Point group: C5
Chain length 313, copies 5
């Protein structure tokens, strides 16, 4: 019973799979991984294990994994092989097997940071099986064996759905045939905390720098504008250490970067206004400084609209 | 290796209890803790029954592979528990005493709203899945449930460890599951936050307020801006030690409120120097005179209002 | 066999234990744990294994662990079950067993930080054994099997002693009998590095702030006193991240918090002197500023003395 | 459980290939990466040979304990690989096809000179040690060598995965070792460094240069020293994410060079106020007038020279 | 066999050892540990296994580890027991065993930080075997089995030599006998990076603080001197979090501490110069400040030499 069940015809062996999530947890943005704890259910027909109900008298016979051949099912993206404990194995009279295990794996599914922290992610778990010489194996989904618990909580995220792509992608690698199945976790980030923790404070320190437009004092203007620039770096650093380095540009990264210009420009202005006022044309100096108090906030709200437009529209 | 047959119409009851030996590594960001305990399991398998007077031994000892043992799992654990079986014992009627020593890492979500004044109820869930030949049902044996007196969770006070006796039995995938809820109850020891965070965070606020006794703009800007920065160091320090909640923490509210008092104190500092640059010190020093009262009052006012919303 | 030696007497089985430290390392203050590598020696009498020296011809017989019953000795405070390798097992003719393993476990021993970093700590390793139904087990110490190597070094600490408490504390849990033994490592922290790294620089930034008392310039005084405040926050945080959050107050914790007052008050003085001097009574202004230059250092040394007294 | 004999005097050739499934966790300070791949091994043991027509099965399936398998190790890995044997199959003539799926953590040093413009070659080394009864020799079967199309190394671009075909055979402790070299070729993705490090690092420098259009010492010192501090924050931030090299990184040169400009800009600032305090503003504002030019020019000059030496 | 080979004399069993380094890596200064991957070679003669080459037909007999008795060789300083996989076992007709394993251990060897980062270290790997009652076991070194690969690289360090001290120190612990062997890895730290990353930037901030000696402006001098103090704290902290806490005084620790004094005195001077200048005695004030411009750098170069002298060596 070690080998695989023989086909009484010309046809491939269909394994029926399902995943029911018990724990979902440890989503790690920098590593782009998350940890999962679930039931795996497997079902297939090995007729060699078939038996007579009345002769045997038991409605169903129970086997150990070493007793019967079980197909080799792998996750494609996992750091290592999953840690699994076999819950139960059952054979129905005709040779239909019902396998149930409980596994803990660490899944590696890449993420999209463009709209961070407003982004939504689709996490992927890929099931795979390699066909043998004596026969070909093909995966399939049994939908009542697919679901998630109601206690499932991914900290800092909202779980929309866990569903499977029912048609497996069959393909050829190194002369054997592989059947790949895709289970998808769909989650949206909880953005609330980012607002009081990062976004608002980052605005306040910016607005504060603008009070330098109501001052003709260079010492106090420089001190003001430079000190708030520094604080904006602390936030820049804080944000960037908590994210992976993307080949592309994050929304927050844009905003954070745009704000770098407004500080640079405001230094020029502060510098210009003091250059005129030292050269005795405060006529222009206070005229520019008068325009600043308006243009600066307008071009901000302007830019932010354009940015938010490019990203979310 | 097959489960005990009913001589009746009835399900199998496994009697569980948990006794805490070590409790430790409560991690706020991860929302996990580590635990070391005895697991006690007890059930009747009549197939193992024997005569007390004939056999002469009060109790018989088996190894785990010898006899059928029910599969009991924790629902919320990072992985399967690491356990060493302490003892197995059979008494004449077929009653088994199973005792193991396990260490697991439990994932129990936390409530951060009152931080760091909060209290938490940690949950350990035991579960068992029913078989085809029979249904298994968990139940609590209370003298097998407790905790050691050396049990200490650092930075926490342990109120109680108790079990909810009625298992919640339900249906998952055509089988039956019996789930039990063991509860650890703890309150956060908040003392250290006072000298470490809450107090220093006030001083810098108060220091920021002496700018109301100054008419000097360079020295007021320096004053108010420097205390702002240190308040960021504290804002950052606090939030890195906490997970990101969909909701608003008490300390988080306070820290955020305090951001406003810095913003307005900046407005005043700027206003006062604008009037006084334009030669109307009449209003300028009048405002600056009024702030010295309003700020501490509007502070104490809000703090009272906040503390009400959170703790009342 | 898989059963414990029968007493021919009314007597308990006494197991003779000792620990000899090979490696000691990774003392972690925040977690309150240390890692240890040692020999465990176990010795007890099982008569079933007894034999005649001259008939059998070997002074001593050697067994593999699966052959004979060995008592289950556990550590009470450890993150997980110890990782151990059996070095040797030997039976002497009368039925005396000599068991030796080499283990590495991670022990969880709580610490007292009140005198930090001038404190001394006693770490506890607890050995335990649970009695079975056919017989009771009791621990005892063989003092020649207890020691530590001379290369044993605990980084950043000085090791005073490794000794065992000889009378086991026996007690009852779940109808069985538990025998608990206590091994004590005694260490004193090496405080030297804290002096150039933390304590001294922290005084300097304080003293530096005090030169504002020889200055009448507010613009430069605020900058001075506020800038040194910030550095004191850096040192406050640097210290606090390396310690667990205690329900009580540390020596270093007191000093650092005490110093926060001197910064707050110095701001008041600095502010007062400038409010007076703007109101044209430099008589008062420069009088206070002259008096602070004395009071501040004296009330410091006063406090430090008072603090050091309470703490020691 | 003994190695196949030699029907002539000849070494045993094991045919190896690695096919990347997951590549991930590239760590610059440790100089490691983690890998998930198939290992394919193939060799001929005639003791296992059988007749295609008489025996009737195209192929026979074994468990690992039945037959002798050569011991193949990786030279650079933190520990032994975690491996699961996928399949073992024997063809009539005695040729074995061995397949496992392993996860290892590889230790390959990196070259940081052009950081973050650098490209790296990661090395996986396979090795086998000869026995007393026979010599074993590695060889590459190229259709068993590849990578999945979903394979992604975060923050890097993967150019190629290829193998060096001639094993370097040599003598260690009286036996013979056949070592094979698999090369992962990757280029760093530098884009993020631009808004996150390089640009802000320039702004704070340029801002410090506005002190040349100001005659105020109080506000100039405040300016120039405060912008210096931010450059330390960036100097520290950069160097903590890199291992300590005996040589000089590009970014390291740039960051170090910029330390000079702050020192000189301080000297200029001090001089200008020393002249202006000693009352020859003729020179003071002349120097300060030249600074507004020299500084940006000697910078752009040096930066070109730096990029030249490095590229 | 669970028992050791019998003496044909009154003499001990000599196990012949060697270590050949494959990988050396993860030197951790704070923990004082490093990781190693090497071959272990063991050779000893157990005559119970002797055989006739022609009768048995094998030139050499190959055994599995459970088949034959192997001595228990342990490492003294390792966090846990080594993780070892056995490469080969071979018996020659006379009963001479050749054992070869490949192990990866994490060795704990304490360090000397006094000359940091100019320091050189000797790392120690200690092998040990405990003697039994029926016989005494004794370690010895076979030098052709001892070496290291030419690819062995310890990051941030230069490896001088890998050699073994051949005479084992045999001694008595708990009524049995221990034979201990000492393998010595000799390394010197690569100090280059420390220069542009710490030492130079740390000198610049000090020198910048000295320009306050060419200024009579107190507001601008206090800002200058105090702000550079802060930067030096960052460098002190950065350096110290990267080192273990020594009971003794490090070279870098000395310099960093000494420099705290030059910052303290420069504040005194800066305070004095403005106290005199406030009291209308510029005669002395600018006189001191004229001397500081000399004394400060000289008392520095003077001190640095005395320090560098005391440390080396
Ligand atoms: C001044 C403000 C700076 C904003 C940053 C400019 C970059 C930008 O936003 O690109 C947006 C664009 C917007 O693309 P995108 O995010 O809208 O693409 C998504 C398309 N939809 C919305 C349909 C899903 O992003 C890119 O072009 C690629 C990402 C980075 C490349 C931009 C290079 C700019 C370099 C700036 C330094
Ligand atoms: C100044 C900061 C104060 C913020 C308001 C505090 C929120 C109080 C509250 O109960 O919120 C309701 C909920 C709590 O749910 P709840 O209040 O509906 O549940 C009530 C439960 N008891 C009665 C026990 C209180 O908290 C939140 O979801 C977030 C806080 C809302 C704050 C508004 C958003 C602010 C964004 C920038 C700040
Ligand atoms: C100094 C600034 C404030 C620190 C106050 C000193 C704390 C001493 C309190 C005390 O000794 O009893 C408590 C004791 C102190 O321990 P102890 O070291 O004083 O006495 C221990 C017993 N002997 C002497 C034998 C070692 O434990 C505590 O609970 C500490 C906190 C007490 C609260 C003190 C108020 C300070 C709060 C500031 C905010
Ligand atoms: C003012 C700027 C000073 C920066 C220091 C300049 C040192 C430098 O860039 O060359 C490093 C030099 C130059 O090496 P290199 O990178 O120019 O050599 C060229 C590289 N190949 C061979 C591929 C063409 O070497 C270093 O990496 C540092 C070692 C000491 C150099 C000082
Ligand atoms: C500023 C504070 C600097 C204190 C300098 C202390 C230097 C002491 C020193 O290491 O001498 C080494 C010498 C030791 O000789 P050695 O260790 O330098 O010789 C080098 C060893 N070889 C050559 C083999 C590599 O003397 C001492 O160590 C005296 C014992 C302790 C020294 C006291 C230090 C106290 C620090 C001040 C408090
Ligand atoms: C800041 C001031 C300190 C900077 C220089 C101090 C350290 C320089 C190296 C040294 O002193 O030790 C030499 C040590 C000596 O090694 P050594 O310990 O083998 O020499 C000892 C020989 N006896 C015992 C006889 C004295 O190492 C060197 O080779 C250093 C060479 C290069 C150092 C140059 C770095 C300076 C650049 C930064 C400015
Ligand atoms: C010149 C002054 C500006 C420089 C200020 C730079 C420091 C600003 C604060 C950010 C420093 C690190 C704080 C926490 O960062 C991250 O916090 C998280 C913990 O909540 C982790 O995830 C990350 O691994 C950890 O690196
Ligand atoms: C008021 C303001 C004054 C002070 C401002 C605050 C300054 C604080 C700046 C320092 C923040 C921390 C930066 C250093 O991060 C480092 O992160 C590295 C990990 O990525 C670690 O690397 C180092 O440690 C290894 C093991 O000990 C060594 O072998 C490496 O050589 C070493 O580089 C170091 O242990 C660790 O120190
Ligand atoms: O083999 C795997 O990848 C798994 O399922 O963990
Ligand atoms: O095989 C089974 O059903 C089991 O593990 O109980
Ligand atoms: O401070 C100044 O010189 C000013 O008012 O521009
Ligand atoms: O056998 C066990 O310990 C179980 O119930 O999982
Ligand atoms: O199987 C589990 O998850 C457990 O209970 O340890
Ligand atoms: O938690 C589990 O079920 C496991 O990993 O075996
Ligand atoms: O000090 C002030 O108020 C100023 O800057 O004009
Ligand atoms: O049997 C023992 O000594 C144990 O508990 O590992
Ligand atoms: O389980 C334990 O405590 C042990 O044996 O270390
Ligand atoms: O010099 C003094 O004593 C003063 O200012 O009062
Ligand atoms: O010998 C083996 O099975 C191997 O390649 O590790
Ligand atoms: O031991 C090894 O090198 C491996 O992981 O294959
Ligand atoms: O102000 C200027 O343009 C100058 O100094 O030449
Ligand atoms: O420059 C100053 O601030 C002074 O001398 O008063």
């Amino acid at each position: 019973m070690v080998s695989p069940p023989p086909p009484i015809a010309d046809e491939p062996l269909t394994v029926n799979t399902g995943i029911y999530l018990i724990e979902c947890y440890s989503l790690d943005d920098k590593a782009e991984t998350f940890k999962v704890n679930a039931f795996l259910s497997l079902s297939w027909k090995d007729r060699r294990l078939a038996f007579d109900p009345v002769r045997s008298g038991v409605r169903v016979k129970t086997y150990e994994p070493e007793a019967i051949w079980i197909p080799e099912i792998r996750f494609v993206n996992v750091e290592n092989a999953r840690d699994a404990d076999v819950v139960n194995i059952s054979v129905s009279p005709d040779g239909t097997v019902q396998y149930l295990e409980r596994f803990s794996a660490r899944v590696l599914s890449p993420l999209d940071f463009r709209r961070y922290p407003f982004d939504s992610q689709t996490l992927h778990i890929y099931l795979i099986v390699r066909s043998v010489d004596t026969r070909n194996i093909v995966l399939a989904v049994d939908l009542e064996k697919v679901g998630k618990n109601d206690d499932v909580f991914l900290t800092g995220w909202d779980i929309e759905s866990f569903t499977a792509v029912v048609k497996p992608a069959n393909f050829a690698l190194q002369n054997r045939l592989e059947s790949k199945l895709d289970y998808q976790l769909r989650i949206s980030r909880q953005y609330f905390s980012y607002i009081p923790n990062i976004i608002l404070p980052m605005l306040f320190i910016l607005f504060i720098s603008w009070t330098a437009f109501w001052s003709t004092s260079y010492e106090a203007n420089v001190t003001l504008v430079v000190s708030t620039l520094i604080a904006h770096i602390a936030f820049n650093i804080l944000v960037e250490t908590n994210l992976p380095k993307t080949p592309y540009m994050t929304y927050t990264g844009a905003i954070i970067f745009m704000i770098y210009l407004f500080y640079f420009v405001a230094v020029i202005e502060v510098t210009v206004q003091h250059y005129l006022k030292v050269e005795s044309q405060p006529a222009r100096a206070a005229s520019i400084t008068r325009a600043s108090r308006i243009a600066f906030p307008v071009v901000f709200l302007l830019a932010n609209i354009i940015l938010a437009f490019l990203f979310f529209g």
